[PDB]
Structures are given as C-alpha cells and as structure tokens.
Design an enzyme around this catalytic site. Structure first.
Site, short mmCIF file in Angstrom:
data_model
loop_
_atom_site.label_atom_id
_atom_site.label_comp_id
_atom_site.label_asym_id
_atom_site.label_seq_id
_atom_site.Cartn_x
_atom_site.Cartn_y
_atom_site.Cartn_z
CG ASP A 1 7.68 65.19 51.91
OD1 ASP A 1 6.83 64.91 52.79
OD2 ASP A 1 8.57 64.40 51.56
CG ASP B 1 7.68 59.07 56.26
OD1 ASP B 1 6.70 59.79 56.15
OD2 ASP B 1 8.50 59.14 55.39
#
Ligand SMILES: *[C@@H]1O[C@H](CO)[C@@H](O[C@@H]2O[C@H](CO)[C@@H](O[C@@H]3O[C@H](CO)[C@@H](O)[C@H](O[C@H]4O[C@H](CO)[C@@H](O)[C@H](O)[C@@H]4O)[C@@H]3O)[C@H](O)[C@H]2NC(C)=O)[C@H](O)[C@H]1NC(C)=O
Ligand SMILES: *[C@@H]1O[C@H](CO)[C@@H](O[C@@H]2O[C@H](CO)[C@@H](O[C@@H]3O[C@H](CO)[C@@H](O)[C@H](O[C@H]4O[C@H](CO)[C@@H](O)[C@H](O)[C@@H]4O)[C@@H]3O)[C@H](O)[C@H]2NC(C)=O)[C@H](O)[C@H]1NC(C)=O
Ligand SMILES: *[C@@H]1O[C@H](CO)[C@@H](O[C@@H]2O[C@H](CO)[C@@H](O)[C@H](O)[C@H]2NC(C)=O)[C@H](O)[C@H]1NC(C)=O
Ligand SMILES: *[C@@H]1O[C@H](CO)[C@@H](O)[C@H](O)[C@H]1NC(C)=O
Ligand SMILES: *[C@@H]1O[C@H](CO)[C@@H](O)[C@H](O)[C@H]1NC(C)=O
Ligand SMILES: *[C@@H]1O[C@H](CO)[C@@H](O)[C@H](O)[C@H]1NC(C)=O
Ligand SMILES: OC[C@H]1O[C@H](O)[C@H](O)[C@@H](O)[C@H]1O
Ligand SMILES: OC[C@H]1O[C@H](O)[C@H](O)[C@@H](O)[C@H]1O
Ligand SMILES: OC[C@H]1O[C@H](O)[C@H](O)[C@@H](O)[C@H]1O
Ligand SMILES: OC[C@H]1O[C@H](O)[C@H](O)[C@@H](O)[C@H]1O
Lengths: 395, 394
Positions: free
Chosen positions: B200, B139
C-alpha cells in the site's frame, strides 16, 4: 563551557547540508564553496531579516582549506576559492554585524580529506583567533583512538581559550563516541558550547525522525546536561530545501525549539520560499528556542503514532509539541488532558493556550481538569505555548 | 482483460489514502466515509476540470458497507453513512458524466473487517451491476490459501462478465501472491484490467521510492505484460496531501506516467493547492500516461544516486525521466548521451527535446552524438519528451 558564550542556543547559517564539498567553481560558480558564496549569504542574512530574527553566525563548514599547511604550518584558505583569505571575509562579515564560523577537525584530516588539526591545535587556534573567527565547529573524523579524540577536543578547547578571543566551540565529540561508548557529558559540557550527538542530518523526513527518535530514546542521558553555555546539537535545520514536505518542515522547526537546539540553517538564502523564510524567522517559535531559562524539553509520551513533547520555559510557561507520526490519511484528532502537561503545574488552576504552529492562534483558557483537542496533519506538529493563569495576573 | 475496457490506464479518484476507514460522521462529518463525501467529490470532479483532464472514475474504497449482508445475503451500504444507497449514488455520479467505482474483497472479509465476497461472488457481481457500478477494486485480504485467492479472482472476473455490464476489474491478486510466490501475469492479465503489485502506498517519499524500486527491481517480469486492457497498478497518486515535498510530488506524477500506471488520485478535492491541481491536471504528462501505444516504460539505468527511466510513445517519440535519488545537498548536475536513449533510435539522426517537469521548457535539437545536461533536485525528477527529427519532417 564557561566562556560566557551561547547563553542561549547559537543561531546562524552553515553551508554543509545545502552545499556540501562542492569544489567545482568552473562548472558551478554559484554553489561551489567560495568566499563569494559566503559574502552573498552575509548580505542576505542582513537584507532579508535573518540577522534580526537572531541568525547571526555565518559558518564555513568543510572544504574551505587548501590541501596543505603553509610553510609556517598554518592551515590555508583554498587560494582559488578564497583568494582574499579568511581574514578579509571575517572583516566583511563583521562589517555586516554578523560573526564568522569556521570548520576544523580534531584528527589527522577533516571528513572531506583536508588538513586536520592533530598536532597543530595551538597554531590553528591562534590562526583562527587572529583572522577574527568567532565560532569553530570541530569535527571528529580521522582519529585513531578515543583517548586521542577526547584529548584533541580538550586541547583545542584550552588552545582557543588561551588566544583570549571569544569563540563559540562546537564539538562533535559525543557523536564519535556512540554507540558503545557512553560519552561523559559532564566532561563534554566543561569544554564545549555545543555538541553533535548523532548522525549527520540530511534533506529527508527519514533523517529528522531518526534524530528525534534517537534524542527521545536517549533523553534521560542528555536532556539535563543541556543549559546556558552548553547545548545538545541535533544538527542543521534543513527547512527550505528539497526533501521535506511542509508539515515535516514545521515538525523540524517545532522540535528544534523544544529541544533547545542550536539553529543553524543549511539552505540557499538566495532562493528560499516565502513560507520557509516565515517559518524559520517565526518570532514566537524562535523565542521558545531562545527561552532564557535554557531548559531543554523532552518527549512526554507517545503511542498510537502520536508523540507529545514539552519544554519548561521561563516565567513558569511551557512549550508543548504534538507530532502526528501516522503517515497515511488526513489530519488526525488528538486529545490530551491539560493536567498531564507541565508535570501538572502548567495548567493549575488553569493555563492560557496559544497555538504557535502550524499557524498562530489563541485557544483561550483551560481549567486544570479540561481536555485539549487538536487535529494534527500526518508528519506535522502542533506547537503550543501554555501560560499559567496565576503567573499571568502577576503584571 | 478482454472486456474492451481500460484501453489506456484508468483515471479517477479513490478515497482510501486520503480518507481511510473513517466511520465517525458525528465527530467528523466532513471526512467520514459517506454518500456526502462522494457527492461533493463528484461535483468537484466536474466543476474543477478533473473530468476534463481525464479523471472519470469516482471510486469508493473499503468501509462503505454495513457490517452484514441483508436477509437476501446481499452486501449493503452502511444505512447511516449511505442512507440513499449505492444505486442513487451511482445515478448521481452518472448524471455528472462520471462513473462509479466500488470495493470488495475476495476473501471472507475486507481488509477493514467488513463482509468479504467469498461465497457470494455471483450475488455480489449481480448486486454491483444492478446498482450501475462501473469499476470494482477487488482486494486480497482474509484468504486462507493461494488456490482460493486465484479462484476467487477468476470467479469474480467471470461473474462480472456474466452480468453483461462493463465494469473495470481491479485485482490485488499479484500483491497477495508476492509474499508466498511468483505470480503468473499471463493468467492475471487474462482476468484483470489492472492489478496491484505491491504494498500500500501512503503519504511518504519513503513509500514512493519503495514502489519505484520494487518495480524497477522486478521490471523483467512485469513491464511487458502491461498494455491496453491490462495494467500494472503502483497504487494511488498521493500528490496534493501532506507528506510529500513538491519535488517528490513531481517525481510521482512523472513516474506514474512513465510506468503507464492507472491514475487514481487520493486526496481532498475540496482543499487542494493550485499547484497540485496543475500538476495532476498537467495535460502533457497525462498524455504520456495515456499514450495510445500503451507500452509501459522501464528503468534504463541507475547509479551514483541517479536513475534514468524511459518509455516508448506512439509517433516514434519517447518519454525520459531522470530521478535524483541523493537526499542531501542541492540540484545535482546529470549528463547523458542522447545516443543511449530510446534504444539508440530516439535521437538518430536528431531529436527535439522538450522538458515537461519540473517545468515545461523547450530544450532544442540534439544530434545523435550529443549529450544532454540537466540539473535535478534532490528527490525530484526531470521529465522529457523526445521527438525524432525524421518524424517532424513528416
Ligand atoms: C578562558 O577560560 C576561563 C576559565 O574557565 C574563562 O573564565 C570565566 O569567564 C566567565 C565568563 O566571562 C566567568 O563568569 C563570570 O563571572 C563573573 C564574576 O564572578 C560574573 O559576574 C559573570 O556574570 C555574567 O554572566 C551572567 C549570566 O550568567 C550575565 O547576566 C552577566 O551580565 C555577566 O555577563 C560571569 O558569570 C567565570 O567566572 C570565569 N572563570 C574563571 C575561573 O575565571 C574565560 O572566559 C575563558 N576565556 C575565553 C576568551 O574563552
Ligand atoms: C465477457 O467476456 C468476453 C470474452 O472475454 C468479452 O468478449 C470480447 O469483447 C471484446 C471487446 O468488445 C471483443 O473485442 C473486439 O472485437 C471486435 C469485433 O471482432 C473488434 O472490432 C475490436 O477490435 C479493436 O477495435 C476497437 C476500435 O473501436 C477497439 O475497441 C478494440 O479494443 C480493438 O482494438 C475488439 O477486438 C472480443 O471480440 C470479445 N471476445 C470474444 C472471444 O468474444 C466480453 O466483452 C465480456 N463482457 C463484458 C460485459 O465484460
Ligand atoms: C565525568 O567527567 C566529570 C568531569 O571530568 C567528572 O566530574 C568530576 O570528577 C572529578 C574526579 O575525577 C572531581 O574532582 C570533580 O569534582 C568532578 N566535577 C564536578 C564539577 O562535579 C565525573 O566524575 C565523570 N563521570 C563519570 C561517571 O565518569
Ligand atoms: C595521526 O597520524 C599519526 C602518524 O601515524 C599517529 O601516530 C597519530 O596518533 C594520528 N592522530 C590521530 C589523533 O589520529
Ligand atoms: C472463510 O471462513 C471459513 C470458516 O472459518 C473457511 O472454511 C473458509 O475456507 C474461509 N475462506 C477464505 C477464502 O478464507
Ligand atoms: C500462466 O497461467 C496459465 C493458466 O491460465 C498457463 O497456461 C501458463 O502456463 C502460465 N504461464 C507461465 C509463464 O507460467
Ligand atoms: O565533511 C564535513 C561533514 O563531516 C561530518 O560528517 C559532520 O558531521 C558534517 O556535519 C560535516 O561537517
Ligand atoms: O526535567 C528534566 C526531566 O524531565 C522529564 O521527567 C524527563 O522524562 C527526563 O528525561 C528529564 O528530562
Ligand atoms: O482497507 C482498505 C485497504 O485494503 C488493502 O490494504 C488495499 O491494498 C488498500 O489499497 C486499501 O484499499
Ligand atoms: O521493453 C521491455 C523490457 O525493457 C527493458 O529491457 C527492461 O529491462 C525489461 O525488464 C523489459 O521491461
């Protein structure tokens, strides 16, 4: 409006969201706007238990009329889509034990572009009365000024009254006043049975939320005007269609009950899932909507992507809705002190809590000092009924 | 990335959307992030036919780690929630014939606030490879600069390579770039097996649409970089959860196939509707996703609240997706000339069209010059397979 009508919010079915202004009976005979469409719905409103649940008004929305008035200045049913005219259709509906709703516009044209009632209010009122119409949705499109808007609405209100026939009068008046024109609800209340406040609903969770938020945001201004004979209309139930997750459907059913909204389904009664039918015919929820006290609910509090709404019911009972607004993850645990509910009366010294949605389940007695824990699905709502233990003992 | 992996888009299951950073095993033992959660999913991935449909990576997302590195500066599994550690869990997963995915962050901290890998890339790569990890989602959170961002990602890429273990490398590199600047996909493609481009996903139609739209808007820069060993990642399949209508679920399944996206389900495999299961395990759709040619599809055209997407498949076949974007009313009729499809080759001289979604149905032979009429539900998608008739001769 003091016409003895809509003592509880009006329930029924209205074609618009589902079916819109579909004029193509050649390519789309089963979903173009036609006498056939309404007759089919009418049979099913009876055969599928919709009438028994309380859905009684079968309503025609826009695009039923032909493109001009007849040589006597009357609005006409489209000749090819309503060959037997409105009268026969009203007769049909009445034979089913249902009532007929129709659609007109206060301005020069309906929103779809068909003949408005401006300059014909009396003619049109009389026309509707004679056909046997029982409900009129009166839209705000194509009005040049707010003065006119207000007038047309008041005029139609009296014109209808003068025909001597009971007709539920539904006015989109306040919606065409927003955002810069604080509508006078005292005035609106006097002339209308219900009124559209906000933008058109559609088949989306976005739209539902927009409506809920607009309602709660504007709540002080509108909750207390609502009552028997005069309701706030947050638009059609869109449950059973295409754009809502099950949880979202639940939220609409729940909240429309809390808001004491009219209940106009817009869907295809011919093709509706057993669940949708069950939710929309949910007898405990409908009872909450139709509570005879007729006191519209409100948002109690919000935060952390939760909302709590509550509604006072007759018998000093209360409806409580808890909405999980967080659109990620799983069922989220929520805890409230029953003391906060029903302005501290609902559960003093105790209250019995029944969950109504997403499933019916008795949750037992909560002393006034206790806390209630729930788990609420993302975009879902838990609906609750609180019975004060005191009033319970009383027979 | 040239590590021999992800020759077709990676399939599996990832905890995040469904389960998030739930650390409360006391109040919520069944949905807090624990070794138990993953073991249950692992059994079900086998027992429920997920493995057979192709879902083989069981992936841990954020909040598996303890709040610090041990004395040897290693990331540690939370001692309470992963008492037997990752090693044993990887073993478990491997015994089922599945592989294990894990989650780290290129910056000083993971998005949830746990130890980042900045300054520990080699240690961390080695720690994972030791344990038997097979996939890493890496990430972009808590990175001070884009220079660093780019470096950390390239470093971990090599660090992983140096361990000598096959590990699918998933990089959110491009997504954390887009705020500051245009990402170099040539570069990204070199170091990564797949890459998150966008914000997201969550359990909403709003978010799916936003993803579809962002992609279609940017398709010029991104569609052609995608291929075997390197994929665009539009994020988790959220089918089978809470916030999507059936039609929207269909739309996601359809479009992720068109887009040659990795397929990481994020849901509760313990409680998933027969329908969801069926859609997600749909073997004709999965085949399209997993088409060996590995050419990502694109939006062909849009307007009047319709979109047409199409994807070239091996055997001179084509996938075609038609999305009804109008969120009011009923099923809306749409008509296209088959001539427009597959850059005019798909149906010349003819093609046999099979509908795959919302239901499977053989539509028949269509000549070059003919038109196809569909009815598409609001927010739904009709997915099509076109076989060129010349190929059915052969
Ligand atoms: C045209 O407009 C006029 C004037 O506004 C309107 O007249 C009003 O009608 C209502 C309803 O019929 C009258 O209200 C009734 O008054 C009587 C006597 O005072 C009451 O007993 C009635 O009680 C009913 O409602 C109760 C619920 O509150 C029920 O429990 C009970 O069983 C009764 O049904 C009722 O309140 C009102 O007084 C008149 N107003 C005037 C000034 O005359 C008329 O109805 C309109 N006509 C049409 C066709 O729209
Ligand atoms: C560490 O990084 C290095 C360099 O990036 C990487 O080495 C590369 O490995 C790949 C994949 O194994 C090699 O590519 C293959 O090479 C062989 C022999 O020439 C070919 O036969 C393969 O061709 C095709 O056929 C196969 C069909 O079975 C397919 O599997 C394959 O995908 C091809 O379609 C294939 O091209 C490549 O040669 C090296 N590159 C270099 C420069 O050495 C190494 O794998 C990385 N290590 C780890 C553990 O990740
Ligand atoms: C909103 O409109 C209502 C109704 O027209 C107003 O209430 C009436 O006001 C008139 C004077 O204009 C009085 O004669 C009546 O007694 C009132 N009706 C009742 C039953 O109370 C009200 O004044 C308007 N409010 C505002 C703020 O403009
Ligand atoms: C409709 O049209 C006429 C003629 O232009 C106009 O004067 C009238 O006020 C309009 N009516 C409304 C309510 O908009
Ligand atoms: C991590 O934090 C340190 C100290 O605050 C800082 O110097 C370093 O550059 C940071 N690294 C990243 C990748 O954000
Ligand atoms: C992408 O980055 C690489 C460095 O690895 C560089 O060689 C190349 O010029 C870049 N490509 C583009 C299109 O900017
Ligand atoms: O054109 C018909 C349409 O017009 C307005 O927008 C109304 O708010 C809708 O509910 C419907 O009546
Ligand atoms: O009882 C009516 C009253 O109840 C609450 O206090 C609400 O906040 C107000 O907006 C109003 O609806
Ligand atoms: O904290 C975990 C979270 O981190 C980032 O926001 C990622 O993009 C998400 O997909 C998820 O992994
Ligand atoms: O074939 C790849 C190519 O296909 C279409 O033309 C798209 O518009 C481009 O963005 C690119 O994806």
């Amino acid at each position: 409006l003091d016409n003895g009508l809509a003592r509880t919010p009006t329930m029924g079915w209205l074609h618009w969201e589902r079916f819109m202004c579909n004029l193509d009976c050649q390519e789309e005979p089963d979903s173009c706007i036609s006498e056939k469409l309404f007759m089919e719905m009418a049979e099913l409103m009876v055969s599928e238990g919709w009438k028994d649940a309380g859905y009684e008004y079968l309503c025609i929305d826009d695009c039923w009329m032909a493109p001009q008035r007849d040589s006597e200045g009357r609005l006409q049913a489209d000749p090819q889509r309503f060959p037997h005219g409105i009268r026969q259709l009203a007769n049909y509906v009445h034979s089913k034990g249902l009532k007929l709703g129709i659609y007109a516009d206060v301005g020069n044209k309906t929103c779809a572009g068909f003949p408005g009632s401006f300059g014909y209010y009396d003619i049109d009122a009389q026309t509707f009365a004679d056909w046997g119409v029982d409900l009129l949705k009166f839209d705000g499109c194509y009005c040049d000024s707010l003065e006119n808007l207000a007038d047309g609405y008041k005029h139609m209100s009296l014109a209808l009254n003068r025909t001597g026939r009971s007709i539920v009068y539904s006015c989109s008046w306040p919606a065409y006043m927003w955002p810069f024109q604080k509508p006078n609800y005292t005035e609106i209340r006097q002339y209308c049975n219900h009124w559209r406040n906000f933008a058109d609903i559609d088949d989306s969770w976005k739209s539902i939320k927009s409506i809920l938020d607009w309602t709660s945001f504007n709540q002080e201004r509108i909750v207390d005007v609502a009552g028997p004979g005069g309701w706030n209309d947050p638009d059609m139930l869109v449950i059973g269609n295409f754009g809502l997750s099950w949880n979202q459907q639940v939220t609409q059913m729940a909240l429309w009950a809390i808001m004491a909204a009219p209940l106009f389904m817009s869907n295809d009664l011919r093709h509706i899932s057993p669940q949708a039918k069950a939710l929309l015919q949910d007898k405990d929820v409908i009872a909450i909507n139709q509570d005879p006290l007729g006191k519209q609910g409100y948002q109690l509090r919000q935060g952390d992507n939760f909302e709590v709404w509550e509604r006072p019911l007759s018998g000093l009972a209360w409806a409580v809705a808890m909405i999980n607004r967080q659109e990620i993850g799983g069922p989220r645990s929520y805890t409230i002190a029953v003391a906060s509910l029903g302005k501290g009366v609902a559960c003093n010294p105790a209250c019995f809590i029944t969950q109504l949605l997403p499933v019916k389940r008795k949750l037992g007695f909560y002393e006034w000092t206790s806390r209630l824990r729930s788990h609420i699905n993302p975009t879902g709502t838990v609906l609750l009924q609180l019975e004060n233990t005191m009033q319970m003992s009383l027979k």
